[PDB]
Design a protein around this ligand. Structure first.
Ligand SMILES: [Ca+2]
Ligand SMILES: [Ca+2]
Ligand SMILES: [Ca+2]
Ligand SMILES: [Ca+2]
Lengths: 446, 447, 447, 446
């Protein structure tokens, strides 16, 4: 039996397991309230095994007004109050940047360095904490049009990249937000009865940003003769997607670009440096070219490449992806994945990227992340208003004072309810790891 | 040395192609079968060892409801389906709404006592509620014209790429429990092998289930009220049951048709899997859209491994969804129960139906059953009885009524005869398909 | 152990990436080749053993038809294509409509005395009729901007993920039969191996065919008339031929461009596959949309293994369709003939052209040939000749005509010089590409 | 100065007035809760004057579940809780037929009959209690796409037909609904310093329904040769749009058709009988032909005719209109406006119509309306479900009891708030007429 479905025609003596946000009270809070300024373990899994599937969704609301909804009862209703502020009954505002303030962190085989350290959004192909609806073979986002075109929009994420581990999987959320946020997850794996071959390649992901890129000509018009006649062979100043020591293969990237001059951000060539070569052996032709579009980026999202968020729908930013699944970029010792930031590094745009690759352990490269203050989208902000109240009527002052009093009483009651859910999250964290161990030992006893 | 999902294209295989098709064995342009009312028909039997690689089908079921000025004998040899609007006054072949539920597809492997596939024709091909939706996924597709979409029994092209291996025999049948015949076009592609498949090859299985109503404890309570949300359900004994099967194998997903009655949300219930007879489920989900890898309700998205076929927002309160577990199958050594709470802790009493898909080693230990036809029809609202009283008729109106009734009495029997002729062709080509498959098998084995 | 279509990501391979690209080897921003008029150019030669894993290209072909106020020497170093509306009065680089048909892609493996791929540039990349459509499938994609869609020669991005293994040699050329040069951007990715591929590795092949007109017996009879439908065709001697090849391998699909003349339906014709010299087809289809896994005509769907690239409802009577047999290949030990009746029983006399894709062990037994350029052009209606007479001119109108003609006399030769320089760059970079691929092969093999 | 704008260039010594649902507490409830099973006077105006413009919108919710929103505070928030029932916090369901259960009733010069007596929806070109978004010269509906496609959808209605009156205008809502409903209105007029000419034509509107139409061949296929060769000259059995004695002109209609056989409802000809003639002097060709469409109805709404709700978008029903503003159908003694219900009255469909006309007083015969039971849309109904509860856990029974307890407490609290808002409507009804009288008398004193 041949072809991409053939393994369905053969049984495998492997045991399914799942880390999930399931309500371990048996009730309908099948999510975790991830605490502010804390890391939480979604679970630890003893290998040998393989992550086969991840699904998540999330919400981060800030309470900004008093509500006439009873906050104790409200805590047990639906998790997110999707109610328009115009109704005057509640105001749970959208937190715009929570997708960049939270990280997903994965450590294999009890290494002293993570193999995945990426902003929560970026890892699931939400760039700029601004989701786009799209499908590809390994990553998908299902975003409602009602929610689309907003920073911090709720959406469903799914990852089908396999993540093998011979000894240990530790999956954490690091929440650098001053706000807690709601996380639903289903993380599916299988456990094996024998070790994986020792040269099994493990899933890695890292995140980078150059903001600004150090361009030599950001004020020169893109594609002017002067710009286009500048030379760049060795790519020393190229944007660096990935720079890693070891044996394995690059499987692709997402790239978020905020373009400032309003011409074109994408004349820059991909250039790959394999096993320490001085000049790149793989030379590309342009950035949309690298993403397999042409004459700019199109509103297409195909199995191995395309657009997640189109520049034409936004205030000058693009989110793009390419997967190298059947055409990976292999290396024995070292790989540097670069892209010129504009032709010959002309431009000074805001570039950020997730690199995904597989490699044999140990992970020699110590993966780092920019601090939270360096991960936030660049957005224009309104000037200072400095409003001066008119002379208030006694009625108007009483309205203000009554409202303020409702706010003084209400906010603490919402705070109490967030603290109860955060206590559930920490409790279910250790329960998830305990159940995963029980399942491991029961499977091995066999 | 070649790697990745295209790699088997770079190596030759000493296997012989065959195809069961509705091709016109007169050599003419009726490349379809008129499946008779209330009969089973064998699409074909193939001797193993082999593997089904691809199925394509399309179908039509019209009821003659008015006389036509189209000569019915010549009309039989024109295009098979009269796509003519009734407002033209020249013909009326009405759409049969529920034919996708009235017909079953049935597949038996290795001359077993029980079928391994027994599913309504529509549901098997990811048509839920006998109501097609246009979509693509990796193993199943439906191609539905926008002019036909949004109605029960709409014509559309269905395709299945799930491989179906068989060491000894494949028998593919249509069980037509409809009072009406229907038109079936098919191409079923397969390859034949010169050596047996390995001993614990996993065989393709599919089974259909419905709970209508689900036995909810709180169907009149508002979904997501605090009272509903604080009820506990750990053990899932009253969960909706997608699949309950003894064997060694793996679940590869489902479609799920839900008609939701209260106008809130049907989908808070968790998927819960019970592997190898465990009392509590080892795999705990978070919600029904969550299981379908959507969030905050279902979206109008159809992706390679999950999504929406028919969105609730486009219908009279019903949703058709799917998930494929192709790279993330749910394995079992001895037993699998795939459940979903029907609303949080089985609160709701909606109309749930599902197709379950799985592979397992033979034998098929579980006798696969189907609900009878009267339990497979969509729940639809009906107009109040009319009981119209005729006005006083003129001579001219009574003569128009008489002339028309006379034309109808002459015309319906002439159409009936043309159905019966096409049914004879289907019964004949059924036998011819198997006989050719056998000749092809024997010639391959000789060579 | 790891299973499913992603499994090969979880093991390392000791294989070395390479890439043939139109990268500016001056290190500047002309990362494209100006392919000369009436010339062949080698994109590169690679020494095996290795495998092509990915191709991306885009292109542009404009005809300078008016003088420009843009400095033509400086213009050469700006963006490569002046996407400037003719109504502005400042430049006019007109679209060349048929350049996708006037150029070929030509691939030779292991220094054979025939190419294994010889297909028009467009059709190879699933641009039928020199008229792009936006679509995705598993092996081939076109990303076409809406602003460009719905015209002949529209620019678009093409990509190919079919693997192309080779033990000894890969030589990739463009044959430009156009009177005009064209711009080609390309990234051709491959890997090199440290030992030979198995002897019987199947190599990628592609051939192109056109029957214009098809030799129909009743082009003037209405499609699906009782007279047409009762004609028999078993043996399919007169069927449209997609592929006719001697060897050991498997067909993996096609694209099919049909221009239909009578305004009914072109697709009643059945696929008929003749395996290993059999006189009667063993694989019998039901219809042409049925082969493409649509039904009741073609839909505006493009799914992973089949569908519509350009829909007849969006054009002046032409359709471009595809089907991939990746999990369901049609295998042959000695010979394969892939045919489709051109209308039922070869009734119709439409314009049919096709790309066939197959893999086979070497040798390529027969030369792959192609119809000459005059036989590859789309069939388009033509305006009556408008023999304009000028009115009596004012001195001012004559001076404007004179001034314009003089600008044009000065301007055109300056653009010609700029094309000749870029053509010289393409010929220089052709040789550099091959030299670098040889250095990389040798350094890889050294360790 | 010529053309349709020419009157903007001449001053007129006329005084503006407006009847409105404005909050006469000075607060932000600028609507009336129209009580169930009651008539309420929007206002009475002393003539001479002319209505120039009407704007309304409305809402009718049924409380069907208990809410965690404090119901007393909720009464002073936004007037309509546009909150999805899936959130679990409130359930104010849409009342589907309120547009047909309430009438608009207008009486001129204290006549012993109204001159307008039409269901609230149909008057404002909402057919079948089912809004559709459209514009025309005298009537508009502005309907949000998120509300569209359902019975009882909220939308804004506007009327620009002038309504002159020499002595008196009385404008009422007759609410035959068992539920109250929210009405916002702005009714603009001018008052004049002298009588209008006594031959001034007054605005009339009347509603009719034939359900079923009394067809001779409802089971025969439409456009069958048998149907098409039946004759109808005199049109005795035609659907009647208008049948009135006096001197005036018909200015058009809306027509709601629910079609049963699934072919074409519209082969019937318009046939007008002017001044008592036995045979119609104006012979039409078909129903879509009368609506100035062809080959069925189109999704077009033009200044003088078209589609409000397209059969292609619904469960078998169409709403259409035609205005005869520049091409009115005049009569000296009598007008009968008829349409064959199918060719030669073949069909037995559900037809209802609003007829609009102007005439010199008196209104000869009382304008009557079918009672509420005869005004409801024909809708298919689900089979009786007859659910049986399973054996309940103690926890499930306590859940049901707690919810019932919340409901028993909550519903009467909402009832109380409806009753207070109804008192406001009745109070402002009287204040509207008193202020209109003070305005009349102040203008007249000037
Ligand atoms: Ca470049
Ligand atoms: Ca749940
Ligand atoms: Ca045929
Ligand atoms: Ca007529």
């Amino acid at each position: 039996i041949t072809g991409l479905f053939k393994d369905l025609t053969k049984v495998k003596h492997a045991r399914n397991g799942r880390l999930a946000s399931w309500d371990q009270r048996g009730k309908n809070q099948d999510y975790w309230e991830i605490p502010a300024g804390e890391s939480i373990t979604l679970g630890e899994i003893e290998g040998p095994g393989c992550i086969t599937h991840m699904w998540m969704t999330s919400s981060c609301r800030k309470v900004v007004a008093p509500s006439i909804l009873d906050p104790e009862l409200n805590a047990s209703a639906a998790p997110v109050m999707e109610i328009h502020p115009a109704l005057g009954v509640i105001w749970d505002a959208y937190d715009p940047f929570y997708y960049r303030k939270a990280l997903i962190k994965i450590t294999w085989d009890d290494q002293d360095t993570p193999s995945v350290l990426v902003p929560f959004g970026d890892f699931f192909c939400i760039g700029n904490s601004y989701p786009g609806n799209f499908s590809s073979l390994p990553f998908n986002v299902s975003l409602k049009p009602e929610e689309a075109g907003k920073f911090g929009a709720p959406c469903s994420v799914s990852c089908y990249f396999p993540m093998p581990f011979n000894k240990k999987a530790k999956i954490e959320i690091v929440n650098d937000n001053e706000l807690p946020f709601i996380l639903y997850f289903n993380i599916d794996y299988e456990m094996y009865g024998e070790p994986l071959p020792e040269d099994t390649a493990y899933f890695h992901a890292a995140w980078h940003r150059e903001n600004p890129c150090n361009g030599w000509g950001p004020e020169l018009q893109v594609n002017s003769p002067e710009v286009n006649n500048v030379t760049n062979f060795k790519g020393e100043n190229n944007y660096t997607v990935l720079d890693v020591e070891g044996t394995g293969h690059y499987v692709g990237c997402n790239l978020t670009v905020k373009h400032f001059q309003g011409s074109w951000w994408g004349e820059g060539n991909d250039m790959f440096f394999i096993d320490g070569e001085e000049y790149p052996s793989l030379n590309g032709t342009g950035t949309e070219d690298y993403f397999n579009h042409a004459w700019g980026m199109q509103r297409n999202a195909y199995p191995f490449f395309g657009t997640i968020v189109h520049e034409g729908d936004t205030d000058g930013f693009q989110v793009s992806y390419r997967w190298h699944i059947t055409d990976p970029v292999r290396f024995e010792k070292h790989l540097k994945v670069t892209i010129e930031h504009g032709h010959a590094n002309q431009l000074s745009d805001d570039w950020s990227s997730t690199a995904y690759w597989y490699q044999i352990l140990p992970t020699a490269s110590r993966i780092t992340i920019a601090p939270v203050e360096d991960r936030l989208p660049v957005v224009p902000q309104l000037p200072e208003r400095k409003l001066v109240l008119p002379q208030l009527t006694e009625e108007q002052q009483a309205a203000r004072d009554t409202y303020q009093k409702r706010w003084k009483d209400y906010e603490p009651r919402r705070d109490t309810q967030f603290r109860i859910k955060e206590d559930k999250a920490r409790r279910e964290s250790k329960l998830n790891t305990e159940f995963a161990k029980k399942l491991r030992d029961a499977f091995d006893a066999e």
